Amino acid sequence: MENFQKVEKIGEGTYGVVYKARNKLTGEVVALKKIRTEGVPSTAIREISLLKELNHPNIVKLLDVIHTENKLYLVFEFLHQDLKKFMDASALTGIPLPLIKSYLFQLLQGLAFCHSHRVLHRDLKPQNLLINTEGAIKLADFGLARAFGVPVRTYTHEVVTLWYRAPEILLGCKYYSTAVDIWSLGCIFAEMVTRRALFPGDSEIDQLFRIFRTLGTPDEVVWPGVTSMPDYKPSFPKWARQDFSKVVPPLDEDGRSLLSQMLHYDPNKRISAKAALAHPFFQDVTKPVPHLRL
Ligand SMILES: NC(=O)c1cc([N+](=O)[O-])c(NCCO)cc1NCc1cnc(N)nc1
């Protein structure tokens, strides 16, 4: 790197290597992503550059976008931990409900902001949610999916996780709506509460069938138009829906009600981030500080 001293490798991103680095000139510490191939589309450049204006306290700030020598670098605000690691570290005891509620509330604010500006994330997962010692949580990588493309396998051949993918995406819908993000967040909310992934599919069909086994195989009554979707097959097994009381115990009725609305099959019925913020579940929301050992 030029003006960046590499501090540590944070990981093997979905697009490329990510390093914690220090700007030799400003001394600021940032996350530096090196994106993959042989030219880099300009549309992606214009689109990514636009995200530099998408600023919100619950959105990881994109500081700069640099395209050079067939490489694309993205410079982001640095946070010390991600929610996946935090959940693993809180597995034995569980994240306290007040903190789960604070995190969900902040994430919904972030989604409401992005959605109002017509920006979708499309690939939300615990590892893309970053946290600090002050109790804040932020969405990382908003808008990248639209500017780059389909995942499938990271640059290191790692497998793309399908656990948080909305059913309309799995059924081949070509146009994504803001509802795909609400679905992913509902899945994450459930996982924070139960300490186990809600739908851990290991293939696209396993992912879809895990969803059907819990929420029931969708039909025209609950999801008008589902039988006409690209990948829908009349041969899909017909599973009965299960009760949320069994899905995310021992979450209370306000929590189960909100989760049920974030997981409605019909993208048009699925609650918006804005409406979710007004749900009674958040009546007593607060902002606790997590126990973070860095
Ligand atoms: N912007 C960032 O600070 C950041 C960026 C990415 N990323 O660009 O992928 C990331 N990857 C998720 C984990 O692979 C994690 C981040 N922060 C939390 C963190 C986690 N683990 C270490 N070791 N250090 C920091």
Swiss-Prot record:
Please identify the protein, giving its name as recorded.
Cyclin-dependent kinase 2
What is any one of the record's Gene Ontology cellular component terms?
nucleus
Q: What is said about its interaction partners and assembly?
A: Found in a complex with CABLES1, CCNA1 and CCNE1. Interacts with CABLES1. Interacts with UHRF2. Part of a complex consisting of UHRF2, CDK2 and CCNE1. Interacts with the Speedy/Ringo proteins SPDYA and SPDYC. Interaction with SPDYA promotes kinase activation via a conformation change that alleviates obstruction of the substrate-binding cleft by the T-loop. Found in a complex with both SPDYA and CDKN1B/KIP1. Binds to RB1 and CDK7.
Question: How is it regulated at the activity level?
Answer: Phosphorylation at Thr-14 or Tyr-15 inactivates the enzyme, while phosphorylation at Thr-156 activates it.
Gene3D superfamilies on file? Phosphorylase Kinase, domain 1, Transferase(Phosphotransferase) domain 1
Q: Name the consequence of residue 162 to R.
A: Reduced phosphorylation by CAK and reduced kinase activity
Please indicate which superkingdom the organism of origin belongs to: Eukaryota
The record, for InterPro entries, names: CDK, Kinase-like_dom_sf, Prot_kinase_dom, Protein_kinase_ATP_BS, Ser/Thr_kinase_AS
Which residues does this entry mark as bearing N6-acetyllysine? Answer: 6
What does the entry report about post-translational modification of this chain? Phosphorylated at Thr-156 by CDK7 in a CAK complex. Phosphorylation at Thr-156 promotes kinase activity, whereas phosphorylation at Tyr-15 by WEE1 reduces slightly kinase activity. Phosphorylated on Thr-14 and Tyr-15 during S and G2 phases before being dephosphorylated by CDC25A.
Name positions with the PTM N-acetylmethionine: 1
Cofactor binding, note field: Binds 2 Mg(2+) ions.
The family line of this record is:
Belongs to the protein kinase superfamily. CMGC Ser/Thr protein kinase family. CDC2/CDKX subfamily.
Provide the active-site residues from the annotation.
Answer: 123 (proton acceptor)
Q: Where is this site: CDK7 binding?
A: 9, 84-85, 162
What does the protein in this record do? Serine/threonine-protein kinase involved in the control of the cell cycle; essential for meiosis, but dispensable for mitosis. Phosphorylates CABLES1, CTNNB1, CDK2AP2, ERCC6, NBN, USP37, p53/TP53, NPM1, CDK7, RB1, BRCA2, MYC, NPAT, EZH2. Triggers duplication of centrosomes and DNA.
